[PDB]
Ligand binder design. Structure first.
Ligand code: 3PH
Ligand code: 3PH
Ligand code: 3PH
Ligand code: 3PH
Ligand code: 3PH
Ligand code: 3PH
Ligand code: 3PH
Ligand code: 3PH
Ligand code: NA
Ligand code: NA
Ligand code: NA
Ligand code: NA
Lengths: 485, 485
């Protein structure tokens, strides 16, 4: 509310907001975006402008020159200013059509799932269910910080296996509240816990055939090859478990959390009440409906429609108030919507399809292992900046054609399965993916964020190579026998 | 956070939440919805189910059995459960397609405009611009509460004339903060001010050719008849002014606001600073870009894209924090999204078109005045429950065909103009329309809402008849000469 500004005076009078590090970052970003737009890169004008748009948004997010959710607000404006969206015929949309098309894509089923996760976390924490459940988990984990970390990653991984990683990190953070609440933002162990839940949700989003949209989509292509739930699990669960264990070792090695004193946790043995039993029943029913979504999709259509049921049943019954809904992390929602809009712009432009078909023209005729590693590297570099769902939708159909032409009869299922698993390894950027967006916005009791974008870059990029070597070594070894062709 | 419930005991043990008035309202609503679904009403099954859906949502909103923003969350779920959405060929959408199509309609351009209005109000109130401007307006208004009311309605009406009533009520409430802040929720004058700003924004949404989407759409049809900006103003501005004056008389007559003591307001004559000048410049530029949106639509596409500019320029420069964005009235946003979803369901099912074509087959061959009054009554009963934009989009094309077949050569322009003006008169329900949704959510310093849905029904329904008699008497009299044919 201060109405005063600082000036550099005669050195005739320019304010000091034009000479800060944020101003320098913005100058550099504008410079690079203008250079990309001016210099001819892609033959297609929409793809040429979408390359500049992707670079601009990615640099703005990585440098964090402005708040991450504000770049998310800025994405739709640039999608209309940079005429990147195209119609089905392939012509550039008019600005009005592009605006209506880009504002529609932000609100989606996963926004509903995230809001339901917020509702469930608040209702479990407010009525002492999460506190009771966190006394049995923390009793099993013990008094070693690395073991509590392992328990938290295992819990979020198992949750993401069945209900996906849109809402699993929120629920795990809600169960972690009895421990995270009394931890300052500069505590190494608290940072390790938040980052570990984020990374383990990212890894768990690739294990079960229903753990992510890119897994259901991949199974749609994989089914004709005879791959079922058991074959998918035998390959994707060991890979995810090994990747999660390696990331856990990285986390308790790179963080100075091992020398910490943890409160001894004796499990709470109180009896739940009728209100608490109602909350537990609604939570369990919502989780179960999220697990069997494909068998009730003819009525509900999506998990975002199922996500409404807890919201209505907890807010409509007075268990949660209007102030509780206004206290939701809406910056997380805005950041997620911005990520979705950027992915939709990339898909509509055709930018990623051209990159993927240019890669396809070179690495083809190569062996199945090499086409797997090169494409996995591609979706590891694209997936950390673009949504994994969009990247999988574009690439999984192409690797199928690449493998359908090879002499190996097991080549196509192996490539589709591998690219499905490797489509979730990009986790280095804190402003891409629901688990990452949730963890970057977590704040302590005083309001300071536990994690910066730099910590996410320094750990989640090594945690992306770790989750990528576990798929092309263990996962490929399991596919070599499991996949029959 | 209380884990205990009350029971009726042996009268063997049923809790007391099943015998409250809210439970009775819900029982009645389920009863009526099931009776509507069971009894055959409309030949089209989707329209027959949409009638029950509209009745259910309207009754839930009017009775306030559950919070209004929670019925807004419930609307998309019922749009999928009640299979009311249809494809372009007229076949019922699959639940997945219906879910993806109904969640895409919640986030729109007007949501962005409302968020920008929140941003502008917070940035003007936080940096003392609004308190400076409210010292010159309240000096002109004087020390009579009815005159302050007149000034507030005039300000919001003039704002809605140029930038529409999506953000004008928010800006007017921000300007009224120096007066509304120190007023408790049970004060008659505060309730009169909030309701008056709501009602005057509703009336102002019909005056200028760019005051509402149903005015731009109507001008699109009116242009071939020779009607221009001057002809539109000569008819719509006197009608709006008279309706606003009659509503102001209703407000200072039905509220015990006339016996009140108001603080003497001396104009604040301080000089703005560079930061305040930057805020003023950005606000004025955003308003001006909203006024000339049709001349810059080839670049921006919508006013919701223009609405992003203040958000980025105020949040990205640090003038507003993340906590300021989390303190936004998000229940208003959810309620608006629910209204939009209900309107889209009504449009897709074809329910409103069938009612409007059933009316058209009866009232046709009558005089131009009678077809005007009957259709205006229809859009006054539909517009208070369904969005005015959807109702206008459905009906304005039909009254054109009704008038194009009459013997009067001025019949079609008169009917299109009248139905454009009468499409904004429905203002009786507090959960329909941006000005109404904004006013029903306003809270005092202690958190108590100024207005209930009952107050909105008791004053805005007589304020809807008042705004409807002003169009068919003054407006029609002006059209009788202004319209040439
Ligand atoms: C309104 C005040 C600021 C509001 C908030 C600030 C951020 C949003 C507004 C500014 C964004 C850039 C608008 C101007 C360029 C749009 C692109 C365009 O016209 O089409 C491409 C443009 C024209 O394509 P057209 O759409 O076919 O006309 O490409 C070209 O062929 C010409 C490019 C020449 C170089 C122009 C210099 C632009 C530098 C990059 C600026 C990006 C900054 C993003 C924000 C970062 C900091 C926050
Ligand atoms: C002055 C510019 C340099 C400034 C320094 C920083 C700029 C950051 C670089 C970001 C990418 C922009 C440069 C790439 C342009 C290549 C276009 C080209 O040669 O096309 C010819 C060539 C022919 O045009 P066509 O007829 O459209 O096929 O295009 C291709 O076939 C594709 C070439 C490969 C393009 C790779 C682009 C990057 C992929 C990853 C995207 C997602 C990550 C975004 C963040 C980047 C950082 C990791
Ligand atoms: C206690 C906590 C709250 C949670 C409780 C919710 C439990 C109920 C949800 C599961 C029921 C769904 C079973 C039907 C799904 C299969 C559809 C199918 O096979 O499609 C064929 C069929 C058409 O064939 P298709 O086009 O090939 O799918 O699909 C339909 O037409 C869908 C049938 C609509 C059924 C209406 C009821 C939906 C569930 C009620 C909504 C929630 C209110 C619950 C109130 C209490 C009731 C217990
Ligand atoms: C076959 C005959 C069916 C009869 C009609 C259906 C009856 C069951 C559904 C409607 C229940 C309405 C009465 C209870 C809710 C009103 C009170 C309230 O919300 O506050 C409670 C109350 C606060 O209000 P207070 O006690 O009045 O202060 O909150 C609680 O104590 C916790 C809530 C406990 C359970 C309430 C909801 C139970 C129903 C959920 C099951 C599925 C509902 C499906 C709805 C559509 C059905 C087609
Ligand atoms: C899951 C637990 C509760 C969650 C939150 C509570 C509110 C949402 C869930 C309940 C909403 C109603 C679901 C069951 C009926 C759906 C309609 C349907 O199946 O299609 C029409 C249904 C079937 O059409 P179909 O879609 O072609 O199968 O219409 C008919 O022809 C049969 C109608 C017979 C009467 C059924 C009784 C329903 C009573 C109305 C309930 C509405 C209550 C709304 C909530 C108010 C309180 C909050
Ligand atoms: C047991 C039911 C009574 C329970 C008591 C409370 C019910 C509240 C009434 C809400 C409306 C539902 C009843 C109307 C059904 C008429 C259908 C009919 O006769 O069609 C035959 C008839 C022939 O079917 P067709 O082949 O589809 O044309 O339909 C028509 O031509 C249209 C008939 C006029 C329908 C008027 C419906 C109401 C218009 C306003 C909608 C927006 C406001 C929503 C809130 C209402 C309160 C103001
Ligand atoms: C200080 C507070 C901030 C506000 C300042 C913003 C002021 C600038 C906005 C107004 C400029 C728009 C003029 C062009 C609109 C007419 C388009 C037309 O005739 O369509 C034909 C033409 C195509 O014909 P059509 O398909 O029939 O429309 O439309 C276009 O291609 C659109 C041209 C794109 C121009 C790129 C620049 C857009 C404005 C820059 C975005 C904001 C960043 C400002 C940075 C500082 C620069 C001052
Ligand atoms: C032709 C050559 C063009 C050169 C490149 C364009 C330069 C102008 C646009 C970029 C300005 C970047 C430096 C200033 C902003 C960083 C500091 C900040 O946000 O905090 C300020 C500062 C807080 O940060 P602190 O002072 O560092 O603590 O807040 C203020 O004092 C109020 C903000 C005053 C005005 C700042 C924004 C002015 C630019 C708006 C005009 C349109 C922008 C269009 C962007 C895209 C262009 C293509
Ligand atoms: Na995956
Ligand atoms: Na990422
Ligand atoms: Na109107
Ligand atoms: Na209304």
């Amino acid at each position: 509310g201060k109405l005063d500004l600082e000036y550099y005076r005669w050195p005739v009078a320019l304010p000091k907001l034009f000479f800060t590090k944020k101003a320098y970052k913005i100058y550099f970003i504008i410079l690079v975006t203008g250079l990309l737009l001016g210099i001819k890169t892609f033959n297609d004008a929409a793809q040429h402008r979408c390359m500049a748009l992707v670079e601009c948004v990615a640099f703005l997010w990585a440098s964090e020159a402005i708040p991450l959710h504000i770049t998310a607000f800025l994405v739709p404006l640039l999608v209309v200013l940079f005429k990147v969206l195209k119609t089905s015929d392939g012509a550039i949309m008019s600005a009005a059509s592009a605006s209506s098309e880009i504002l529609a894509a932000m609100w989606s089923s996963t926004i509903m799932i995230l809001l339901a996760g917020f509702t469930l976390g608040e209702v479990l924490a407010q009525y002492n269910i999460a506190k009771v459940l966190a006394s049995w988990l923390l009793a099993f984990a013990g008094c070693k910080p690395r073991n509590v970390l392992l328990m938290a990653m295992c819990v979020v991984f198992f949750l993401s296996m069945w209900i996906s990683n849109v809402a699993a990190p929120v629920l795990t953070y809600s169960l972690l509240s009895p421990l995270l609440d009394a931890m300052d933002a500069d505590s190494p162990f608290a940072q390790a816990l938040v980052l570990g839940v984020a990374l383990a949700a990212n890894i768990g989003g690739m294990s079960s055939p229903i753990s992510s949209p890119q897994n259901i989509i991949s199974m749609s292509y994989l089914k004709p090859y005879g791959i079922g739930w058991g074959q998918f699990f035998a390959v994707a669960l060991p890979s995810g478990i090994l990747a999660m264990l390696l990331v856990w070792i990285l986390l308790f090695t790179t963080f100075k959390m091992n020398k910490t004193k943890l409160e001894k946790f004796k499990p709470i043995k109180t009896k739940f009440t009728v209100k608490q039993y109602y909350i537990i029943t609604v939570t369990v029913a919502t989780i179960l409906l999220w697990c069997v979504e494909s068998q009730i999709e003819g009525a509900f259509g999506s998990s975002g429609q199922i996500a409404i049921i807890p919201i209505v049943l907890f807010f409509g019954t007075g268990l949660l108030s209007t102030q509780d809904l206004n206290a939701f992390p809406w910056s997380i929602v805005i950041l997620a919507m911005g990520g979705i809009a950027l992915g939709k712009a990339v898909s509509s432009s055709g930018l990623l399809s051209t990159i993927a078909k240019a890669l396809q023209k070179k690495i083809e005729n190569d062996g199945v292992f090499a086409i797997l590693c090169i494409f996995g590297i591609l979706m590891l570099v694209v997936g950390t900046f673009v949504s994994h769902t969009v990247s999988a939708i574009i690439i999984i159909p192409l690797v199928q054609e690449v493998g359908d032409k090879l002499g190996n009869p097991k080549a196509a299922p192996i490539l589709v399965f591998g690219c499905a698993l490797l489509s979730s390894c990009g986790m280095g950027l804190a402003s891409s993916g629901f688990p990452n967006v949730t963890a970057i916005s977590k704040v302590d009791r005083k309001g300071d964020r536990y994690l910066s974008v730099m910590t996410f870059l320094t750990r989640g990029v090594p945690a992306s190579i770790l989750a990528f070597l576990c798929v092309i070594t263990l996962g490929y070894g399991i596919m070599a026998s499991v996949v029959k062709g």
